[PDB]
Design a protein around this ligand. Sequence first.
Ligand code: ADP
Ligand code: ADP
Ligand code: CL
Ligand code: ZN
Ligand code: ZN
Lengths: 69, 69
Amino acid sequence: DDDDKKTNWLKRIYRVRPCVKCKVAPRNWKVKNKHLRIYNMCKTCFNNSIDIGDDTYHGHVDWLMYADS
Amino acid sequence: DDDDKKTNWLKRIYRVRPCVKCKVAPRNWKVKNKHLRIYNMCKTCFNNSIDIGDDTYHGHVDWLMYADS
Ligand SMILES: Nc1ncnc2c1ncn2[C@@H]1O[C@H](COP(=O)(O)OP(=O)(O)O)[C@@H](O)[C@H]1O
Ligand SMILES: Nc1ncnc2c1ncn2[C@@H]1O[C@H](COP(=O)(O)OP(=O)(O)O)[C@@H](O)[C@H]1O
Ligand SMILES: [Cl-]
Ligand SMILES: [Zn+2]
Ligand SMILES: [Zn+2]
């Protein structure tokens, strides 16, 4: 089943690349209708980046959650 | 740059999972407007599957080619 290839990929994509900033925590994310938005940082490091004034790691990658578009 | 995280992922996704049927050739694919469609089989095994009457591996996974949806 093709939807499961996509789901297992997202599961892996999410797991093997932690927060770009602290490198250990997993990334923040949310579901935005038909896509999964994976933010570049965990929530702790994102808030911290505002405080310290660094917007270098700000960003996200959206992933279609289904196999067919 | 976020578009590049998506591109490098697709590059990897495409490379580490060859044809589901013969297991060596890389998969067929095409660009369908804003998505990359990765078919489950290379072209040789897909045509062959019609000939032998097996539709078990028929299918594809579409991937949004950009970071933002
Ligand atoms: N945890 C995070 N790590 C990195 N960047 C983030 C994080 N949370 C938000 N951002 C960035 O801040 C902005 C807010 O995004 P978001 O709230 O998803 O947009 P929208 O409100 O349109 O859904 C975007 O640039 C997003 O990439
Ligand atoms: N190389 C291949 N491997 C596996 N399945 C395939 C392959 N080529 C086509 N198919 C399947 O046959 C059908 C034809 O798909 P496609 O021509 O992409 O649709 P469309 O013409 O709407 O763009 C779909 O079920 C597709 O998944
Ligand atoms: Cl996707
Ligand atoms: Zn972090
Ligand atoms: Zn093959």
